[PDB]
Amino acid sequence: AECSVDIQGNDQMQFNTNAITVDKSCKQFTVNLSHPGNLPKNVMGHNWVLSTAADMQGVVTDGMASGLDKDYLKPDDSRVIAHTKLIGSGEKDSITFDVSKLKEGEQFMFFCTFPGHSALMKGTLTLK
Ligand SMILES: [Cu+2]
Ligand SMILES: [Cu+2]
């Protein structure tokens, strides 16, 4: 089974997927994030941040408060399971994380933590 996904965030605050499936036999999983828009990082930055569903609101809230130089994530936030860096127009970032962080049946959310973006830029991740 494949163990990666390619995702885009654009100038309209849209991800091109709202649901990610990680195959149970994967030991690592890779997320390839790209920004095909034209707007720069400081006004339309996008990251891909993963947490349990219950933790998302907290991660997003503290994140936005943390500011651009911290990629809109609270330092040493143990609620973040895995995340890309924050990127603007024309950039791309890839992260690979351990599936051992992803328990069978548990509910996970991915989202962008750039201010205001998470309402429209979010989706589910599950291990099947
Ligand atoms: Cu495989
Ligand atoms: Cu964003």
From Swiss-Prot:
GO molecular function ontology, one term from the record: transition metal ion binding
InterPro entries: Azurin, BlueCu_1, BlueCu_1_BS, Cu-binding_ET, Cupredoxin
GO cellular component: periplasmic space; plasma membrane
Cysteines paired by S-S bonds: 3-26
Coiled-coil residue spans: none
Domain Plastocyanin-like, chain residue ranges per copy: 1-128
Record Pfam families: Copper-bind (PF00127)
List of residues binding Cu cation: 46, 112, 117, 121
Protein name: Azurin
